[PDB]
Amino acid sequence: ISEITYSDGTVIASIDYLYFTTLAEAQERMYDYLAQRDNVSAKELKNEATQKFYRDLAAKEIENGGYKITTTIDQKIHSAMQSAVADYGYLLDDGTGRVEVGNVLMDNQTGAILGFVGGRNYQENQNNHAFDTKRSPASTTKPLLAYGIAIDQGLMGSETILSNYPTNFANGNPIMYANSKGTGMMTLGEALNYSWNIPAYWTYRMLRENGVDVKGYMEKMGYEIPEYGIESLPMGGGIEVTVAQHTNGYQTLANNGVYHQKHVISKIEAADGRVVYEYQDKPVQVYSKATATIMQGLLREVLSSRVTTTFKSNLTSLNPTLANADWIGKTGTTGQDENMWLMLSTPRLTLGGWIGHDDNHSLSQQAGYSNNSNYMAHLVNAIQQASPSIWGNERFALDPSVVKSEVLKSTGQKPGKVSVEGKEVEVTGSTVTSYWANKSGAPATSYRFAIGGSDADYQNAWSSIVGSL
Amino acid sequence: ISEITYSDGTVIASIESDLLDYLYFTTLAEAQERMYDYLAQRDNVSAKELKNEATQKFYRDLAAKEIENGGYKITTTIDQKIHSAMQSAVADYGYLLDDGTGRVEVGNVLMDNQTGAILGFVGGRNYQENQNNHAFDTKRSPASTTKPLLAYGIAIDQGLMGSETILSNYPTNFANGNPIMYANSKGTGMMTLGEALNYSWNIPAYWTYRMLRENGVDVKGYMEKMGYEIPEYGIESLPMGGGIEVTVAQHTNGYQTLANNGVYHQKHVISKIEAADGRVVYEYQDKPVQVYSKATATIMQGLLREVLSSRVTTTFKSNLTSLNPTLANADWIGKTGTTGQDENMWLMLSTPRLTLGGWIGHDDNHSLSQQAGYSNNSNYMAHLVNAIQQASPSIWGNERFALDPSVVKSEVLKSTGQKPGKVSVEGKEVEVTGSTVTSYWANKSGAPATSYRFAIGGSDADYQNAWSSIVGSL
Ligand SMILES: *[B-](O)(O)c1cc(NC(C)=O)cc(C(=O)O)c1
Ligand SMILES: *[B-](O)(O)c1cc(NC(C)=O)cc(C(=O)O)c1
Ligand SMILES: [Cl-]
Ligand SMILES: [Cl-]
Ligand SMILES: [Cl-]
Ligand SMILES: [Cl-]
Ligand SMILES: [Cl-]
Ligand SMILES: [Cl-]
Ligand SMILES: [Cl-]
Ligand SMILES: [Cl-]
Ligand SMILES: [Cl-]
Ligand SMILES: [Cl-]
Ligand SMILES: [Cl-]
Ligand SMILES: [Cl-]
Ligand SMILES: [Cl-]
Ligand SMILES: [Cl-]
Numbered sequence: 043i044s045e046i047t048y049s050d051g052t053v054i055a056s057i058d059y060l061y062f063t064t065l066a067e068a069q070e071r072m073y074d075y076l077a078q079r080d081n082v083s084a085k086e087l088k089n090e091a092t093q094k095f096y097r098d099l100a101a102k103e104i105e106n107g108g109y110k111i112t113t114t115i116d117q118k119i120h121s122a123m124q125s126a127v128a129d130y131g132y133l134l135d136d137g138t139g140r141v142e143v144g145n146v147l148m149d150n151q152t153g154a155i156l157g158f159v160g161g162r163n164y165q166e167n168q169n170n171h172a173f174d175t176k177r178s179p180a181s182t183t184k185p186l187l188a189y190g191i192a193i194d195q196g197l198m199g200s201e202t203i204l205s206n207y208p209t210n211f212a213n214g215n216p217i218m219y220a221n222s223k224g225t226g227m228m229t230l231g232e233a234l235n236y237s238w239n240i241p242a243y244w245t246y247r248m249l250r251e252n253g254v255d256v257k258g259y260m261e262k263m264g265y266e267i268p269e270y271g272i273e274s275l276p277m278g279g280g281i282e283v284t285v286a287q288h289t290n291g292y293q294t295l296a297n298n299g300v301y302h303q304k305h306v307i308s309k310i311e312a313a314d315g316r317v318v319y320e321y322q323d324k325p326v327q328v329y330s331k332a333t334a335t336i337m338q339g340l341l342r343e344v345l346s347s348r349v350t351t352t353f354k355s356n357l358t359s360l361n362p363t364l365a366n367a368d369w370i371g372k373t374g375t376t377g378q379d380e381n382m383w384l385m386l387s388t389p390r391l392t393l394g395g396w397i398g399h400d401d402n403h404s405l406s407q408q409a410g411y412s413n414n415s416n417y418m419a420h421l422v423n424a425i426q427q428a429s430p431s432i433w434g435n436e437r438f439a440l441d442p443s444v445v446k447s448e449v450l451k452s453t454g455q456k457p458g459k460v461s462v463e464g465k466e467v468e469v470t471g472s473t474v475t476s477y478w479a480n481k482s483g484a485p486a487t488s489y490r491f492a493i494g495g496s497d498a499d500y501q502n503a504w505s506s507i508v509g510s511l
Numbered sequence: 512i513s514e515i516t517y518s519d520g521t522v523i524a525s526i527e528s529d530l531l532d533y534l535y536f537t538t539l540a541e542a543q544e545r546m547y548d549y550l551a552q553r554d555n556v557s558a559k560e561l562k563n564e565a566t567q568k569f570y571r572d573l574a575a576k577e578i579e580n581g582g583y584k585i586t587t588t589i590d591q592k593i594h595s596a597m598q599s600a601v602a603d604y605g606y607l608l609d610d611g612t613g614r615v616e617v618g619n620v621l622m623d624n625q626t627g628a629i630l631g632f633v634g635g636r637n638y639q640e641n642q643n644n645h646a647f648d649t650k651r652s653p654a655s656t657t658k659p660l661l662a663y664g665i666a667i668d669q670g671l672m673g674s675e676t677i678l679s680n681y682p683t684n685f686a687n688g689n690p691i692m693y694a695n696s697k698g699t700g701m702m703t704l705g706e707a708l709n710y711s712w713n714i715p716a717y718w719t720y721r722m723l724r725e726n727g728v729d730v731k732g733y734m735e736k737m738g739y740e741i742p743e744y745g746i747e748s749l750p751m752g753g754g755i756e757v758t759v760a761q762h763t764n765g766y767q768t769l770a771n772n773g774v775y776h777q778k779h780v781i782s783k784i785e786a787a788d789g790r791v792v793y794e795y796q797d798k799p800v801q802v803y804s805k806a807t808a809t810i811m812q813g814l815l816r817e818v819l820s821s822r823v824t825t826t827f828k829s830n831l832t833s834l835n836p837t838l839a840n841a842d843w844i845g846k847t848g849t850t851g852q853d854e855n856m857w858l859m860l861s862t863p864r865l866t867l868g869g870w871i872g873h874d875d876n877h878s879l880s881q882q883a884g885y886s887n888n889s890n891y892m893a894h895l896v897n898a899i900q901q902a903s904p905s906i907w908g909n910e911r912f913a914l915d916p917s918v919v920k921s922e923v924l925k926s927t928g929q930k931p932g933k934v935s936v937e938g939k940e941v942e943v944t945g946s947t948v949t950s951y952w953a954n955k956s957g958a959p960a961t962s963y964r965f966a967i968g969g970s971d972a973d974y975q976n977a978w979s980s981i982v983g984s985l
């Protein structure tokens with residue numbers, strides 16, 4: 043009778059979060075294997091009755107067969123993660139009841155899942171918040187769906203300027219962030235650190251205007267998103283993901299643009315040793331190396347800046363060496379504080395983390411900012427203790443293909459002549475290196491130098507700019 | 512022969528004559544200052560004679576001899592378990608300060624808010640390597656930790672602003688024509704007190720101090736009640752710490768005053784000297800002074816609570832949270848400091864029971880790294896605050912700072928920090944309206960009606976520009 047092992051061949055069980063997660067995945071691979079073995083047509087496989095039967099026939103196969111199921115799970119690491127959430131999960135409770143939690147640690151280079159947190163305590167609550175739970179990824183959407191795609195397309199670079207000026211949705215309601223209706227122009231860096239919404243709204247809207255196949259990108263990463271025609275899409279509206287699937291997105295950015303499909307099972311072998319399933323590596327360059335490495339740079343500072351997450355502070359206090367790893371990441375917070383995300387990467391690993399309530403009520407305001415950040419610092423340390431060089435010491439680095447431009451700070455763009463209602467101006471001032479992922483680098487400065495902005499906005503910004511020579 | 516004891520009576524050391532450790536020198540030195548004052552007054556020397564240098568030297572010599580040969584018991588306020596714990600903390604965690612500019616030195620004073628007793632201190636990285644006492648001897652500019660005491664606290668006390676009053680942070684020059692800078696920023700716009708505190712902007716502080724001069728406020732009087740020695744008050748950048756130099760111990764005494772509801776207790780490390788024959792030659796006398804009203808102090812507490820919790824200029828609450836979440840939930844308030852070339856970092860922390868002063872920098876005054884104060888010092892002091900807890904788990908207390916009853920509350924416009932009402936904007940009189948906030952004052956009657964110059968500071972151009980904005984939003 044059959045076995046599931048850790049990656050080193052150590053038996054997990056013969057046929058708790060660990061048990062069911064790995065088994066359910068093994069059964070899903072067994073389901074595929076049998077449907078292909080019986081030549082079940084794709085029409086047939088859509089049939090509900092057929093699915094039940096084959097779901098049931100895969101389950102019995104594992105029980106009765108004598109298969110070895112090799113998982114990707116690292117015993118020391120996964121176990122250290124269980125202790126972590128046991129020891130430190132209480133840091134999440136903030137007076138809104140018992141806060142649940144999902145984490146997935148993924149190898150950036152393989153997609154393998156080394157260990158995971160399923161929830162506060164399987165014995166109290168059996169919902170798997172790492173693999174099953176689907177929640178809006180909120181602002182963690184932005185680097186993937188908006189900004190990363192805009193850069194990859196050549197429509198934006200590291201120090202391009204976006205409008206966070208007040209603006210409304212089609213219905214007339216103001217696009218909000220926290221309680222702000224917006225401010226003014228702003229670099230991509232600042233838009234990312236503070237997690238503004240308006241800048242993301244204009245970015246997505248620009249992608250639609252340029253006809254960019256955004257679905258194409260998201261699908262290459264395994265994202266199932268049913269409707270792309272949504273103005274708040276890039277802020278995580280109309281999207282729902284597992285922590286495992288979402289971790290896979292950040293795995294893509296971290297792995298210099300190259301997707302590896304997540305997996306928890308690497309091999310199933312019949313009792314006579316014939317492989318019935320084995321994981322096939324299909325790297326996929328979702329973003330250009332320039333794009334991914336440019337994005338790595340920005341997400342480095344999302345964490346450094348500490349604007350929306352205290353994480354680096356927390357990690358520094360618990361483990362100052364570890365804190366010097368080249369961490370990058372992105373927070374998410376849903377509009378009523380229903381869900382907090384913190385996504386973290388070093389060159390080697392990605393660790394995704396969600397918290398919230400099962401019934402979807404609000405957390406405290408600081409639940410993502412402080413609590414989750416603190417918790418994940420403890421979790422990241424606990425993985426370190428268990429496997430001391432697993433995080434690695436590599437730095438993320440700009441790909442040589444990255445083009446570097448001299449732009450004005452004020453416009454995001456090369457200095458140049460511009461007309462400001464009549465009066466042409468020679469536009470001059472302090473400059474910055476901007477990183478682009480196109481052939482040619484930044485354009486020269488135009489009147490509409492920014493992503494988004496009304497006319498009014500533009501004669502307000504140009505006002506100050508002109509003032510400032 | 513003579514002995515210096517911890518506060519429970521344990522012996523720290525014997526004083527006998529020499530042939531021809533911070534704790535020894537610090538406690539002995541203050542004991543000799545006491546013996547000095549005693550011997551002088553026993554002999555009826557007057558401030559006339561005691562101004563004469565041959566006479567000081569005589570009475571300093573006499574006080575040394577007296578403790579060396581006499582049979583005095585000297586009782587210090589030092590708490591042995593806590594002080595030890597602090598020596599351990601700097602030993603274990605001092606390296607957290609080293610940022611690549613060399614060996615960063617450090618001074619700390621833990622003070623009891625209710626008496627001014629010093630319970631323990633850190634004198635430097637390692638007395639062996641360097642004997643400069645950075646807790647008691649080194650004087651440095653308190654930088655922006657000047658602002659609550661010299662500027663905003665006094666303004667509130669004098670009824671010239673309240674908790675949500677607006678201040679100008681629009682660009683402006685010193686009298687010589689140079690811009691008042693903060694980091695690289697030439698300024699922004701109008702600003703609540705709270706925001707001005709959390710970011711530690713300079714211009715609001717500049718204007719605040721200017722106001723107090725225009726109003727002839729006795730700022731020296733306040734600072735002196737707290738033991739501060741500032742030689743020259745006519746200095747534009749005073750409130751930012753310009754032309755001020757202080758020990759960690761003196762400066763801890765200033766934050767003690769705000770923390771103890773406005774009431775100052777003079778710092779001391781010695782509570783009693785007693786002779787063998789029963790003669791008490793010195794015993795510390797409790798002499799509370801109300802420097803700020805309880806209203807002012809408790810309002811200030813609320814603002815300093817958020818300086819820490821906003822995490823703008825320090826990571827401390829984050830650091831402490833990860834080290835000791837329960838302790839991070841005590842009622843911490845504080846203020847940071849950074850001199851203009853990054854030479855000096857300060858963090859001043861209080862709970863209702865204790866104040867902990869912290870300075871870091873280099874004995875030769877060269878620059879620290881840019882984040883030394885924001886991050887390094889904040890992290891170290893969270894380690895230090897925690898180590899103090901471990902040694903004495905109730906010492907910090909679970910009490911909360913709270914507004915005194917005497918605090919006046921007012922409904923004001925968020926835009927103007929003043930009560931809603933009509934204003935004359937450039938000819939046409941306007942119905943100044945919008946969302947409100949509760950603002951705390953330490954006067955009789957609270958906020959005024961909004962006037963054209965609602966803010967502390969600002970030029971005509973500035974006020975135009977800001978009203979421009981406010982009129983828009985109606
Ligand atoms: B983000 O910082 O997680 C974020 C995302 C949104 N998106 C949507 C669709 O509401 C809103 C907000 C916010 O207004 O706080 C933040
Ligand atoms: B403060 O945030 O510690 C502060 C204080 C000063 N003071 C003086 C006298 O220059 C300057 C600055 C600064 O230029 O950043 C900050
Ligand atoms: Cl293993
Ligand atoms: Cl920023
Ligand atoms: Cl699409
Ligand atoms: Cl999905
Ligand atoms: Cl569509
Ligand atoms: Cl799998
Ligand atoms: Cl077999
Ligand atoms: Cl950092
Ligand atoms: Cl922080
Ligand atoms: Cl280039
Ligand atoms: Cl260029
Ligand atoms: Cl191009
Ligand atoms: Cl317009
Ligand atoms: Cl000394």
Ligand SMILES: [Cl-]
Nearest residue numbers: 517518519591
């Ligand atoms: Cl003691």
Ligand SMILES: [Cl-]
Nearest residue numbers: 705706709821
């Ligand atoms: Cl603020």
Ligand SMILES: [Cl-]
Nearest residue numbers: 729730731744
């Ligand atoms: Cl004065």
Ligand SMILES: [Cl-]
Nearest residue numbers: 738739740761
């Ligand atoms: Cl002084």
Ligand SMILES: [Cl-]
Nearest residue numbers: 743744745746
């Ligand atoms: Cl004067």
Ligand SMILES: [Cl-]
Nearest residue numbers: 582786787788
């Ligand atoms: Cl005697």
Ligand SMILES: [Cl-]
Nearest residue numbers: 803804805806
């Ligand atoms: Cl009073």
Ligand SMILES: [Cl-]
Nearest residue numbers: 918919920921
């Ligand atoms: Cl009242």
Ligand SMILES: [Cl-]
Nearest residue numbers: 920921922957
């Ligand atoms: Cl009122």
Ligand SMILES: [Cl-]
Nearest residue numbers: 954955956957
């Ligand atoms: Cl009054």
Ligand SMILES: [Cl-]
Nearest residue numbers: 970971972973
């Ligand atoms: Cl003017």
Ligand code: NA
Nearest residue numbers: 237373374375
């Ligand atoms: Na966020």
Ligand code: NA
Nearest residue numbers: 605606607609
């Ligand atoms: Na060191």
Ligand code: NA
Nearest residue numbers: 711847848849
């Ligand atoms: Na400061």
